[PDB]
Structure formats: C-alpha cells, structure tokens
Amino acid sequence: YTRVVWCAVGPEEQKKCQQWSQQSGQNVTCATASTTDDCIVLVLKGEADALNLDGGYIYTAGKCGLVPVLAENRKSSKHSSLDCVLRPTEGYLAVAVVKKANEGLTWNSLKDKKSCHTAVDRTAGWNIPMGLIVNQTGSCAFDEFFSQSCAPGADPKSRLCALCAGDDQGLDKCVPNSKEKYYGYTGAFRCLAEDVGDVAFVKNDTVWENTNGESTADWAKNLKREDFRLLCLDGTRKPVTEAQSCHLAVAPNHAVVSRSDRAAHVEQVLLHQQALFGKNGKNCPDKFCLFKSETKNLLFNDNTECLAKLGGRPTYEEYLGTEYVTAIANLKKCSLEACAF
Ligand SMILES: *[C@@H]1O[C@H](CO)[C@@H](O[C@@H]2O[C@H](CO)[C@@H](O)[C@H](O)[C@H]2NC(C)=O)[C@H](O)[C@H]1NC(C)=O
Ligand SMILES: *[C@@H]1O[C@H](CO)[C@@H](O[C@@H]2O[C@H](CO)[C@@H](O)[C@H](O)[C@H]2NC(C)=O)[C@H](O)[C@H]1NC(C)=O
Ligand SMILES: COc1ccc2cc(CCC(C)=O)ccc2c1
Ligand SMILES: *[C@@H]1O[C@H](CO)[C@@H](O)[C@H](O)[C@H]1NC(C)=O
Ligand SMILES: [Fe+3]
Numbered sequence: 001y002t003r004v005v006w007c008a009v010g011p012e013e014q015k016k017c018q019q020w021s022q023q024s025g026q027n028v029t030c031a032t033a034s035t036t037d038d039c040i041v042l043v044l045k046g047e048a049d050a051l052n053l054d055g056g057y058i059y060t061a062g063k064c065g066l067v068p069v070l071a072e073n074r075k076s077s078k079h080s081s082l083d084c085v086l087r088p089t090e091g092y093l094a095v096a097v098v099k100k101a102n103e104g105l106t107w108n109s110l111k112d113k114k115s116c117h118t119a120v121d122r123t124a125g126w127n128i129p130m131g132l133i134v135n136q137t138g139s140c141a142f143d144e145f146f147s148q149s150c151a152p153g154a155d156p157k158s159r160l161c162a163l164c165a166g167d168d169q170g171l172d173k174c175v176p177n178s179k180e181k182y183y184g185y186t187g188a189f190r191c192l193a194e195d196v197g198d199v200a201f202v203k204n205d206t207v208w209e210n211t212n213g214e215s216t217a218d219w220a221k222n223l224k225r226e227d228f229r230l231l232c233l234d235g236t237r238k239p240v241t242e243a244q245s246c247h248l249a250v251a252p253n254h255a256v257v258s259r260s261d262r263a264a265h266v267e268q269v270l271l272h273q274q275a276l277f278g279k280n281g282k283n284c285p286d287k288f289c290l291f292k293s294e295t296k297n298l299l300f301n302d303n304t305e306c307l308a309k310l311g312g313r314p315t316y317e318e319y320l321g322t323e324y325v326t327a328i329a330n331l332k333k334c335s336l337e338a339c340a341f
C-alpha cells in the first residue's frame with residue numbers, strides 16, 4: 001500500500017538497495033538499471049518511483065516531467081536554529097583540481113591536457129566546466145579540447161573515454177555507473193590521484209574526503225591535500241582550503257526526484273526511512289546506514305546528513321536555478337523544451 005520502488009544505478013547500488021529493502025521490511029524495494037538515464041526512464045514508465053540525482057540529471061528528469069522531492073543536505077555553518085530536514089540547502093562548490101607538482105597548469109593552459117570527469121551531463125563534472133570551456137573557446141567542439149579524458153557516458157571508442165578503465169575485469173569501460181573505476185566524484189578524483197588525468201572536475205568535498213586519512217581506500221590512503229591545487233577562473237592556483245574563493249560554480253544539491261503523482265508518497269516514506277537509517281537514525285549504524293557507502297557515494301552521497309524538505313514546492317527549474325538551467329540549455333545547443341525520451 002505504501003511501498004516505494006527505488007532505482008539503483010548499476011550492481012553496487014543494487015546491492016546497497018537490496019540491503020535497504022531487507023532492513024526496511026520491503027517498505028522500499030529495488031529496480032536496477034545500468035545508467036541514470038535508464039533509471040529516469042523506469043521512473044517515467046512507473047516501474048520505479050524515485051532516485052537521487054545530480055543537478056544535470058535533474059534537468060533531464062525535469063524536462064520529462066519528474067519533480068524534485070527532497071534534497072541532500074550535508075554539514076553546514078549558518079541556518080543554526082534549524083533541524084537538518086528544515087535547513088535550506090547551500091549548494092556545493094564545483095572545482096577544478098590538479099596536482100601541485102603539475103606546475104604551471106592553470107585554467108588558461110587546460111587545452112590538450114588530460115581530464116577526469118564524474119560523468120557526461122553531471123554538474124561539477126561536465127555541465128559547469130564544459131559550459132565554461134565552450135563559452136571561452138567560442139566552439140562546440142568540446143570533444144576536441146582535452147587530448148584524452150575519462151567522461152563516463154561518452155562514446156567508449158572516443159577520446160572522451162580514452163582514460164576510463166572499466167571494472168576489475170577491464171569490462172564496461174566508460175559506463176556511467178560505479179563499475180567504471182573512474183566514475184563519479186571519487187572516481188574522477190582517483191583518475192587525478194593516479195595521474196591518469198591532469199585535471200579532475202569534482203566538488204570541494206571530494207578533495208577533503210579522500211585525503212589526509214579521510215579515506216582508507218588503497219588509492220587514497222596516502223594522499224595529502226597539500227599535493228593538490230584548485231584552478232581558479234582568473235588563472236591562479238590555490239590550496240584546496242580556498243574553495244570558497246576558487247571554484248567554477250555553486251551547484252544545486254543532489255536531490256530525490258519522482259513522478260509528480262508519486263512525490264507526496266515518496267517524501268513521506270523517505271522522511272520515515274531516514275529517521276531509521278539516516279545520520280542519527282534509530283538503526284544506523286547497528287543495522288543499516290542509508291548515507292554510508294565506504295566513500296563510493298552509492299544511492300546518496302556519503303556526506304549527506306539528511307534529506308531536506310524543499311521550501312516553496314519548487315519546479316525543477318526553480319530548484320536548479322534560472323542561471324544553471326540556461327547554462328545547460330546553452331551547452332546542449334552543441335549536441336529547447338522536450339523530454340529526451
Ligand atoms: C570543503 O569540503 C570539506 C569537506 O566537506 C569541508 O570541511 C568540512 O567542514 C565542516 C564544517 O563545515 C567540518 O566540521 C568538517 O570537519 C570538515 N571535514 C573535513 C574532512 O575536514 C569544507 O568546509 C569545505 N570548504 C568550503 C569552502 O565549503
Ligand atoms: C555561457 O554563455 C551563455 C551565453 O552568454 C550564458 O548564457 C547566458 O547567461 C546569462 C546569465 O545567467 C543570462 O542572463 C543570458 O540570458 C544567457 N544568454 C544566452 C544567450 O542564453 C551561459 O550562462 C554561459 N555558461 C556558463 C556555464 O557560464
Ligand atoms: C542547494 O541546491 C539548491 C537548491 C535550491 C536552489 C534554488 C535556487 C533558486 C534560484 C532560482 C532561479 O530559483 C537556486 C539554487 C538552488 C540550489
Ligand atoms: C514500514 O512501514 C510501516 C508504516 O507505513 C510501518 O508500520 C513499518 O514498521 C515500517 N517498517 C520499516 C522497517 O520501515
Ligand atoms: Fe553533482
């Protein structure tokens with residue numbers, strides 16, 4: 001009667017979803033698809049109810065009629081009187097990250113370097129950096145800017161996938177799910193950390209959560225923040241402590257989307273689910289933590305404190321903000337009002 005079908009992207013998210021499903025007594029169940037776009041289609045068909053999406057994906061989903069329902073909310077400094085669920089989200093900082101040792105690499109020298117992206121169509125990983133590059137370059141040939149990239153979701157035979165590594169068996173190169181070694185925030189940062197790419201397009205939080213012992217993962221356990229620099233738009237380089245003065249954009253927080261007709265029910269169930277499995281949840285960590293994935297950001301980002309209610313009932317365009325929507329629209333002209341499916 002009140003069962004929510006979550007859409008998991010790839011087999012690792014599927015595994016976490018199944019654990020959530022078990023622990024929830026089948027109040028949540030799981031559909032799985034290979035890509036985020038496929039999950040959006042499942043939701044559109046009514047074969048799944050909801051999933052949590054990066055802003056670039058919210059754009060795709062929103063064009064197709066899906067609506068934002070609750071947003072990720074991480075640790076915050078203002079909005080102090082307020083409980084996390086009622087606290088207004090503050091967006092995250094999209095950054096360009098390089099190795100300090102890669103001296104003289106700036107925003108202005110990026111042409112014909114190697115790049116690491118979270119995925120095509122994602123905010124910090126793609127829409128922001130490529131939007132800026134297309135703009136300043138005056139060219140839609142964003143596929144010819146970097147010499148090689150890992151941009152999960154691009155054509156696997158193209159240079160945009162050249163740096164992608166696939167899964168442990170070396171299969172699924174460039175798939176836009178966590179099976180691709182260099183997928184997502186953590187994967188794109190790993191792509192930089194291992195010096196596969198010269199630059200990673202990620203968010204401020206990724207740099208911090210994967211350095212100075214914050215991650216015990218083999219590739220990350222030895223990383224020091226001091227070995228990294230942020231690329232500012234004015235051509236300068238800054239320590240990763242300076243993200244507030246050296247970022248590419250403020251991104252709208254990842255958020256849960258659903259069909260408008262299921263939004264009320266999805267919200268209700270999620271608010272109850274996080275009461276059980278969220279940050280201070282009754283049953284986390286003893287049984288299941290909804291916002292933990294061993295840094296793999298499965299289903300939700302690992303730094304999520306809670307899912308927050310959205311003031312005003314925003315449309316997807318209101319949630320993303322007019323400037324970001326128009327930035328995406330402008331970028332999409334390279335590849336105006338219609339669902340892609
Ligand atoms: C960039 O991201 C990092 C990681 O999320 C932020 O550092 C955290 O900030 C909170 C307070 O907001 C601290 O209580 C945590 O201890 C910090 N985490 C770590 C691992 O150090 C940092 O504030 C962000 N910088 C900006 C400018 O937003
Ligand atoms: C890239 O350039 C386009 C075109 O100038 C930008 O789109 C403009 O954005 C401003 C500020 O939000 C709007 O007031 C204009 O109406 C937009 N112009 C057009 C022609 O659509 C876009 O924001 C830029 N992209 C990025 C990522 O900065
Ligand atoms: C943290 O993620 C969010 C959440 C809601 C947002 C709402 C807006 C509204 C600004 C407009 C034009 O609606 C902008 C950016 C937003 C970013
Ligand atoms: C499932 O949902 C109902 C409320 O609709 C509740 O009675 C039941 O205990 C819930 N259990 C879990 C584990 O979420
Ligand atoms: Fe994102």
Ligand SMILES: [Zn+2]
Pocket residue numbers: 247249250
């Ligand atoms: Zn700013």
Ligand SMILES: [Zn+2]
Pocket residue numbers: 312313314315318
């Ligand atoms: Zn409104």
